[PDB]
Ligand binder design. Structure first.
Ligand code: CLA
Ligand code: CLA
Ligand code: CLA
Ligand code: CLA
Ligand code: CLA
Ligand code: CLA
Ligand code: CLA
Ligand code: LHG
Ligand code: BCR
Ligand code: BCR
Ligand code: PQN
Ligand code: SF4
Ligand code: SF4
Lengths: 220, 30, 75, 146, 81, 75, 142, 68, 42, 150, 142, 74, 78
């Protein structure tokens, strides 16, 4: 089991490096745009021409990189926790057999060890673990809000604001209040940054809740 | 005793004065 | 039909409405909007109109149905 | 200039709300500030660093203060394997009654949080032994922050 | 000046950028450095919205009209309200 | 796996994948195995189209296997 | 130089039932645009803000809130109906500014006498790297 | 009296413009403009296509290396 | 007749014909030498 | 019921209705010219018909799935828990997609086939003119339901 | 009036276009510029509207296309009836429909995948179906 | 133990990404292609194709087989 | 026979696929448009090349020595 996981760890480091190293060396320029240096580290894109240039700034190379970092560190901490959580119980056979097929990781680590966490509060009562049960879902909620900014891009929301900024300008008793700063949808880069902020926060809080509750539930 | 005073102050008052202080500074014009 | 059923019936009324909103906006604004005044000339499924005017990613009617699919998948 | 942000004129005249968002993200990027010079670039960084040390010392004076005002540090020493280390106390006026009971543990009198940062063992090893060592430990770091 | 539009010397005077400006920025002026004897020119950069379609229709080696996005004004942001 | 796979298309953009393609293309020039249908990255509205399609396929099939196996065993 | 501009009069606007895409408070504070064209025949066209309105004989006039909108219709008229048009800019105080042809001739073809504002006489690859402009008000392209 | 300048026709040329799409590539000269003021005379046709689909553009004399 | 052969030579049609033959071959070998975890000849 | 309904629209003999004339009598004060002109724009464009058919066939599939679980029509279908769950789930998904298709082809009609100089309609015109109201009001409800359901 | 005027032999049945991929569209027919070509081939296969500009041909293509869609369904139906006849415990299911699962698919045992042949009972084995044809074939008295 | 070992790896994951991120800003803002003529730094911009492709190869080889052997085990 | 023997068995096959495909692209490279001969594969030409992958280790190793397995600095275009 420890053989196969280590390559999965090794896969993360190269692929994570590949994005970052590809970002660094092509920062000054490349064939798709050989004067990328004239725009800075972070710029949105370069327009639809030449076949479309979405996600070309060296910034975006850092952007995609973080996803592979969280996945990679996901595969590392997962491995450390399960190997130790079987050891501390003196049940070392369970890891050494289940850890060779994926359903073993999904059944015997995720599904099995979260039995005490999700009962933090039920229609029967609550426990000390309730706060970790709440944060657990709170992790799922922020993470799922992250997708909203990564998938849905700006031009849609901008047309949505304009209708809204018309409705507010015609409603009686509410045309007496006027924005000082005009309302516009977030910029293209901002959405990526904002979208990644949610994804990371939700990804840390979710795992951090499961890690503490499941272990402290048994204290062993 | 002491928490019952300091928790609201940092939870309710200190936010309110903070938000209202920035809002004027952000929205100034000179 | 008790309370627990009352909530979920108002969930369905929510996701149905949101799905209607996305698709309906696409149909009406498939020819023009206050952002792009000549969107019709750009066809039915075009990616964007470049990063100007703040950024015009996904204004084509094809990208409204592209967004609707998730909510249809959600409802 | 003429308004927030003071360090970027191009953003200042932006009328939309874009200015506010972008006046926060580009605060610390000292190169792209207007009218920057290589002497300022370093002198801001040097002053900013001391700001980051102030936070680190103030942060660590928080831990010592609570562990020695609401914690089990003197009791935990007496049996490290059966006394949950205590991080701080809980005062949340939304708590109902069965939660107040549930979060009362570690031999406290009200709700508490069990400390999982492992400070209790580290300070045991490096020689701290009562509450009083911790209080002066708090004051000193607070002074270093000042 | 809101955005900066720059036209280089590679331009072959094809009048494909000017015809593709949706808000009337670029325009054509005489030259003597091409067979067509005319080169494009950008004397109204204020109203330049930033829609890179102006230079998705410049058919040269790299490009001969280039658009650099600077600060945004109330018309360079295309606000109608 | 297919559901999580679709995210690679929705989140990222084309201009990054076009460039990485170029470096891969160079290695094939070295060994003379560069094809004559020049490699290109998917068009902008295709990156989305593939993105939504997998996402829907992963989401629906997961429920499919979730439902049949559950209900067949309990009745 | 024969460039006396058109000097906007007050003419009758087209028949239209009115829509929600007209001007907003931006008109009363910043600016709004009008685009005066003359037709030979009373037909029906499509408005940039959605919906269809019927142009009437002779001097029309019509106000839109941006410049992209005045031109977007301006292309349609010049293309579909083979018809002339200008447009202006109107300020809150009342000063009106001549905009579109700017010389009497559309910018597509060449007038001997316009300026050359905004040109670099060097290929694009010869710009200066960002180290050569640091701590200055310059940019690579400038 | 002065002979035509640059390559005549059909002569393969190695491109030397750095920012081009065909740098270190080879194309075919289809015509050279003989006007001295012309700033990029040598009209080079290629076999591949740049990202816009174009497959030709002008070039400067010192950016053309006449391979043989 | 020529047009039929040309169509049969376009890429997708070869693919199914080629891969189909490949699938048949591997299935046969696994039917005759099943379980095949090692190569115990030499 | 169907058979009699078949004998309505005029084909070759004297009797029967005219689909053009039915659409040209319903015109109202708020609506103006009413359904005049819809006969053309529903006859010289396939993307109109495909969008309109998709919505109805999409909706009907859903109603099929609501009835087949409450009025079990085939024998020994009720106590077939494997079948009931699948059949209800299957036609919901089919019904869901086909409705989305009706949005796409309605959108395609607006771009390609719609033309207000020949195929002019009045209702489809009025609907365009106040589109800012339609989306904003539908926007508020989607927020209202969002807060009071989730 | 209402009559049946058709044409005779519009398009000649031949195999030429089967060896000229992308014949339908003028843009696609020139050949594979890059791999972008082999994606645009399928994206515009069925868009009969973009190939030609008149309603008559678009009609004849959609009319004939439906026949293909109609034909496949029949072939799909044919398999379902065939499979239920040669590879099913239907006749056994007609005895104790309450507690014998409907099975109408049987897998070849190659790589151990015969474990998929479940004990659906009725002296048979196979993948237990859930499309509920069996209740449909009983309600019609098969 | 778990709360500490997991904590420091995530910190290390973030910090390591920053190191390359400020590598890119170096090549943009402060690098000088003349003062670094042919030294070890400019050459890493000279065979960037060779670096990028092989990283792509090693990732692909690990991806196919680590996943490959895994589905087979599954 | 657990790893090494099956492994060499793969590497033989993998080159055969690799070496044959390389020969075809070079073979059709000198035509009016190599684009058409790859989406519509020439079957006969791919039949007289399909066995040349029986001896790829011998053939390639001679190319490497003779220095025609690689190119030097002429990369795009030609
Ligand atoms: C029977 C119903 C029906 C019919 C006849 C059509 C027919 C058509 N659709 Mg359509 N569509 C339908 C249902 C239908 N659709 C549904 C239910 C949806 C919602 C998911 C859509 C969403 C949709 C979009 C978003 C688009 C079309 C387009 C098209 C046209 C080109 C299709 C093509 O080339 O694909 C070729 C076939 C494939 C690419 C196969 C895809 C393989 C899948 C993913 C597996 C064609 C007229 C396109 C169009 O007209 O653009 C102008 C277009 O952009 N349709
Ligand atoms: C979990 C993820 C998630 C969430 C929460 C949302 C939420 C929302 N989306 Mg959305 N979206 C998502 C994922 C998500 N999306 C994804 C992945 C996509 C891509 C397909 C989209 C695509 C999409 C589109 C295309 C549209 C939306 C719309 C909406 C909004 C309508 C619902 C509404 O008004 O409810 C209100 C908000 C909630 C229910 C959120 C929870 C709020 C709770 C009840 C209380 C919050 C705390 C409270 C304010 C106290 C504050 C505390 C204080 C300290 C600050 C809403 C903001 C629609 C919209 O905005 O128009 C109406 C719309 O058109 N989204
Ligand atoms: C009793 C007569 C009759 C019957 C049973 C059908 C039956 C059918 N017609 Mg139909 N049709 C009829 C008369 C009839 N039609 C007449 C008189 C016309 C001309 C006015 C048409 C024109 C017509 C078209 C244009 C289409 C059908 C289609 C269909 C099929 C829908 C599935 C179905 C088999 C559709 C189909 O599937 O075609 C294959 C289709 O597209 N029909
Ligand atoms: C890689 C090994 C392998 C091979 C060679 C085949 C080969 C085959 N399978 Mg198969 N199958 C496989 C893995 C494989 N399958 C897996 C992993 C599953 C589980 C999802 C199935 C589930 C499956 C069901 C059925 C087949 C069937 C078939 C046969 C016709 C299609 C064909 C001989 C069909 C027959 O038998 C059939 O009904 N397969
Ligand atoms: C001690 C180490 C250190 C230091 C001194 C800096 C300092 C800097 N970084 Mg940096 N960085 C670091 C660690 C560090 N970072 C790490 C660990 C990462 C990986 C996550 C990054 C990723 C990173 C990126 C991707 C970028 C910077 C940028 C910057 C510069 C401007 C920051 C700014 O204004 O945004 C301050 C931001 C805010 C005030 C709001 C951020 C909100 C977050 C989500 C708070 C949580 C500044 C010189 C930026 C730059 O130079 O722009 C040109 C830039 O683009 N860095
Ligand atoms: C299920 C999720 C998933 C999967 C499977 C992958 C898989 C891959 N990504 Mg990826 N990615 C994902 C999510 C995922 N990503 C997300 C969420 C993001 C953030 C947007 C990214 C961002 C990203 C970037 C930026 C890069 C990758 C790269 C890669 C490739 C690495 C090489 C490798 O291991 O291939 C092994 C092959 C497979 C796993 C394919 C298996 C499927 C079968 C074998 C195909 C045939 C089946 C019949 C690989 C294709 C990198 C790359 O191109 O590497 C060279 C790269 O540059 N991805
Ligand atoms: C003749 C076919 C052929 C050959 C000899 C090569 C050779 C090479 N490729 Mg490759 N490649 C090919 C086709 C080929 N490629 C195709 C069709 C694709 C698209 C999927 C790729 C995608 C690809 C990527 C993404 C990468 C390479 C890389 C490489 C290099 C390292 C070897 C490697 O990693 O293999 C990679 C092997 C694969 C990706 C497997 C797919 C190859 C298929 C199965 C072979 C197709 C053969 C052809 C269809 C048969 C024609 C027969 C003819 C008679 C009709 C090497 C120069 C890597 C590199 O740069 O390293 C330096 C790298 O990162 N290639
Ligand atoms: C409360 C509003 C009642 C609305 C009502 O009863 O409408 C009735 C009203 C009747 O219109 P007319 O009678 O003029 O139309 C006659 C029809 O046969 C079409 O001409 O319809 C409208 O004008 C559109 C209003 C839609 C409002 C939709 C709100 C959701
Ligand atoms: C075996 C062993 C040993 C040894 C070890 C070693 C020696 C190791 C090494 C290690 C290493 C050796 C590591 C490394 C790492 C690296 C890294 C991690 C890198 C990083 C980099 C970076 C980050 C970069 C950046 C940049 C860029 C990107 C561009 C330019 C700029 C700069 C530079 C910034 C001993 C005997 C002691 C003991 C026993 C065991
Ligand atoms: C012994 C052994 C081992 C080890 C191994 C190793 C360590 C290796 C290395 C390796 C290496 C370090 C390699 C390198 C390479 C390089 C190069 C450079 C290559 C190249 C190649 C080529 C170039 C080819 C080509 C071709 C051919 C010939 C065929 C196909 C087609 C083509 C064209 C592709 C182990 C432990 C695992 C196990 C046991 C056994
Ligand atoms: C990964 C990715 C790619 C890369 C994907 C590509 C280039 C296509 C995937 C490769 C396909 C599978 C080609 C391989 C099939 C060939 C016909 C060769 C067939 C040979 C087989 C039989 C082995 C994009 O082009 C892209 C574009 C826009 C947004 C996001 C993305 C994106 O996320
Ligand atoms: S879609 Fe957005 S990111 Fe992509 S090219 Fe258009 S503007 Fe740029
Ligand atoms: S970006 Fe748009 S407005 Fe600016 S010059 Fe180009 S086409 Fe004109």
């Amino acid at each position: 089991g420890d053989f196969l996981v280590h390559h999965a760890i090794a896969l993360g480091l190269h692929t994570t490096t590949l994005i970052l190293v590809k970002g660094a060396l092509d920062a000054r320029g490349s064939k798709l745009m050989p004067d990328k240096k004239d725009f800075g580290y972070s710029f949105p894109c370069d327009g639809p021409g030449r076949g479309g240039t979405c996600d070309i700034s060296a910034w975006d190379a850092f952007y995609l990189a973080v996803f592979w970092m969280l996945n990679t560190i996901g595969w590392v901490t997962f491995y450390w926790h399960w190997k130790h959580i079987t050891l501390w119980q003196g049940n070392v056979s369970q890891f050494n057999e289940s850890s060779t097929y994926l359903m073993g990781w999904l059944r015997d680590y995720l599904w099995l060890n979260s039995s005490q966490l999700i009962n933090g509060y039920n229609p029967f009562g609550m426990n000390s673990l309730s706060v970790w049960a709440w944060m657990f879902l709170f992790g799922h909620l922020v993470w799922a809000t992250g997708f909203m900014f990564l998938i849905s891009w700006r031009g849609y929301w901008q047309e949505l604001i304009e209708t809204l900024a018309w409705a507010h300008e015609r409603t009686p008793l509410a045309n007496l209040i006027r924005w000082r700063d005009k309302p516009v949808a977030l910029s293209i880069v901002q959405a990526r940054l904002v979208g990644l902020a949610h994804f990371s926060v939700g990804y840390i809080f979710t795992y951090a809740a499961f890690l503490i509750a499941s272990t402290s539930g048994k204290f062993g | 005793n002491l928490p019952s005073i300091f928790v609201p102050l940092v939870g309710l008052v200190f936010p309110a004065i903070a938000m209202t202080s920035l809002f004027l500074y952000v929205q100034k014009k000179k | 039909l008790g309370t627990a059923d009352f909530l979920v019936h108002h969930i369905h009324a929510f996701t149905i409405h949101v799905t209607v909103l996305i698709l309906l906006k696409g149909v009406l604004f498939a020819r023009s909007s206050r952002l792009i005044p000549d969107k019709a000339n750009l066809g039915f499924r075009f990616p964007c109109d470049g990063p100007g005017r703040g950024g015009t990613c996904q204004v084509s009617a094809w990208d409204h149905v592209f967004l609707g699919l998730f909510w249809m998948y959600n409802a | 200039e003429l308004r927030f942000p003071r360090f970027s004129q191009g953003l200042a005249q932006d009328p939309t709300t874009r200015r506010i968002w972008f006046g926060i993200a580009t605060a610390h990027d000292f190169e792209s500030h207007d009218d920057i010079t290589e002497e300022r670039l370093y002198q801001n960084i040097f002053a900013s660093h001391f700001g980051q040390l102030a936070i680190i010392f103030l942060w660590t004076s928080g831990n010592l203060f609570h562990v020695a005002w609401q914690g089990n540090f003197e009791s935990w020493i007496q049996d490290p394997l059966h006394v949950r280390p205590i991080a701080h106390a809980i005062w949340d006026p939304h708590f109902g009654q069965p939660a107040v009971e549930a979060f009362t543990r570690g031999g406290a009198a009200g709700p508490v949080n069990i400390a999982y940062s492992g400070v209790y063992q580290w300070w045991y090893t490096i020689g701290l032994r009562t509450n009083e060592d911790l209080y002066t430990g708090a004051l000193f770091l607070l002074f270093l922050s000042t | 000046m809101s955005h900066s539009v720059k036209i280089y010397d590679t331009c072959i005077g094809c009048t494909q950028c000017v015809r593709a400006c949706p808000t009337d920025v670029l325009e054509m002026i005489p030259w003597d450095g091409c067979k067509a004897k005319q080169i494009a020119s950008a004397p109204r950069t204020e109203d330049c919205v930033g829609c890179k379609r102006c230079e998705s229709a410049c058919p040269t080696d790299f490009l001969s009209v280039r658009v650099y996005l600077g600060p945004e004004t109330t018309r360079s942001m295309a606000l109608s309200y | 796996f297919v559901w999580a796979f679709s995210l690679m298309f929705l989140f990222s953009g084309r201009g990054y994948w076009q460039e990485l393609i170029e470096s891969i293309v160079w290695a094939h020039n070295k060994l003379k195995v560069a094809p004559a249908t020049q490699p290109r990255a998917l068009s902008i509205i295709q990156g989305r189209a593939v993105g939504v399609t997998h996402y829907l396929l992963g989401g629906i099939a997961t429920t499919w296997a979730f439902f049949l196996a559950r209900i067949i065993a309990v009745g | 130089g024969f460039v006396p501009p058109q000097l906007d009069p007050s003419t009758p606007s087209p028949i239209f039932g009115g829509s929600t895409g007209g001007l907003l408070r931006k008109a009363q504070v910043e600016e709004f645009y009008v685009i005066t064209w003359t037709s030979p025949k009373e037909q029906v066209f499509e408005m940039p803000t959605g919906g269809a309105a019927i142009m009437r004989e002779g001097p029309n006039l019509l106000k839109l809130a941006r410049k992209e909108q005045c031109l977007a219709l301006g292309n349609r008229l010049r293309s579909k109906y083979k018809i002339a048009y200008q447009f202006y800019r109107v300020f809150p105080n009342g000063e009106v500014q001549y905009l579109h042809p700017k010389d009497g001739v559309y910018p597509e073809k060449v007038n001997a006498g316009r300026q050359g504002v905004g040109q670099n006489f060097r290929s694009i690859g010869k710009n200066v790297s960002p180290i050569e402009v640091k701590f200055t008000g310059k940019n690579s392209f400038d | 009296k002065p002979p035509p300048r640059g390559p005549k026709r059909g002569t393969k040329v190695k491109i030397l413009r750095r920012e081009s799409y065909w740098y270190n590539g080879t194309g075919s000269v289809v015509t050279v403009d003989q006007d001295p003021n012309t700033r990029y005379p040598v009209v080079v046709r290629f076999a591949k296509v740049n990202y816009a689909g174009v497959s030709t553009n002008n070039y400067a004399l010192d950016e053309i290396k006449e391979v043989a | 007749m020529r047009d039929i052969k040309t169509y049969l030579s376009v890429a997708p049609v070869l693919s199914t014909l080629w891969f189909g033959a490949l699938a048949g071959l591997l299935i046969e070998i696994n039917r005759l030498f099943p379980d095949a975890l090692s190569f115990p000849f030499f | 019921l169907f058979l009699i309904a078949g004998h309505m629209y005029r084909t070759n003999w004297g009797i029967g209705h005219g689909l053009k004339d039915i659409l040209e009598a319903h015109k109202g004060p708020f609506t103006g010219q009413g359904h005049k002109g819809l006969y053309e724009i529903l006859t010289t464009s396939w993307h109109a018909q495909l969008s309109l058919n998709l919505a109805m066939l999409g909706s009907t599939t859903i109603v099929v799935a609501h009835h087949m679980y409450s009025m079990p029509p085939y024998p020994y279908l009720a106590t077939d828990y494997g079948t009931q769950l699948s059949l209800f789930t299957h036609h919901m998904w089919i019904g869901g997609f086909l409705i989305v298709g009706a949005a796409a082809h309605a959108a395609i009609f607006m771009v390609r086939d719609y033309d207000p100089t020949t195929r002019y309609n009045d209702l489809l015109d009025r609907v365009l003119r106040h589109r800012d109201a339609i989306i904003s009001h539908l926007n508020w409800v989607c927020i209202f339901l969002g807060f009071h359901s989730f | 009036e209402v009559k049946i005027v058709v044409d005779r032999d519009p398009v000649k049945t031949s195999f030429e276009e089967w060896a000229r991929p992308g014949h339908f569209s003028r843009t696609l027919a020139k050949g594979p510029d890059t791999t972008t070509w082999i994606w645009n081939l399928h994206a515009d296969a069925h868009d009969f509207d973009s190939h030609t500009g008149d309603l008559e041909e678009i009609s004849r293509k959609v009319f004939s296309a439906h026949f293909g869609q109609l034909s496949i369904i029949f072939l799909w139906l044919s398999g379902m009836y065939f499979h239920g006849a040669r590879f099913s415990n239907y006749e056994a299911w007609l005895s104790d429909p309450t507690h014998i699962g409907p099975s109408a698919q049987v897998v070849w045992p190659i790589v151990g995948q015969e474990i998929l042949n479940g004990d659906v009972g009725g002296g048979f084995r196979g993948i237990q179906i859930t499309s509920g044809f069996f209740q449909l074939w009983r309600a019609s008295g098969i | 133990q778990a709360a500490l070992y997991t904590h420091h790896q995530y910190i290390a994951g973030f910090i390591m990404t920053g190191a390359f991120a400020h590598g890119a800003i170096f090549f943009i803002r402060d690098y000088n292609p003349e003062q670094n003529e042919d030294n070890v730094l400019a050459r890493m911009l000279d065979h960037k194709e060779a670096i990028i492709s092989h990283l792509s190869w090693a990732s692909l080889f690990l991806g196919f087989h680590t996943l490959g052997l895994y589905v087979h085990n599954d | 026979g657990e790893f090494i023997t099956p492994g060499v068995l793969f590497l033989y096959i993998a080159g055969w696929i690799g070496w044959v495909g390389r020969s075809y692209l070079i073979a059709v490279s000198g035509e009016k448009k190599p684009a058409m001969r790859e989406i519509i594969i020439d079957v006969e030409l791919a039949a007289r090349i399909i066995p040349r992958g029986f001896i790829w280790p011998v053939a390639a190793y001679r190319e490497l020595i003779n220095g025609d397995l690689v190119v030097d600095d002429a990369d795009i275009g030609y």
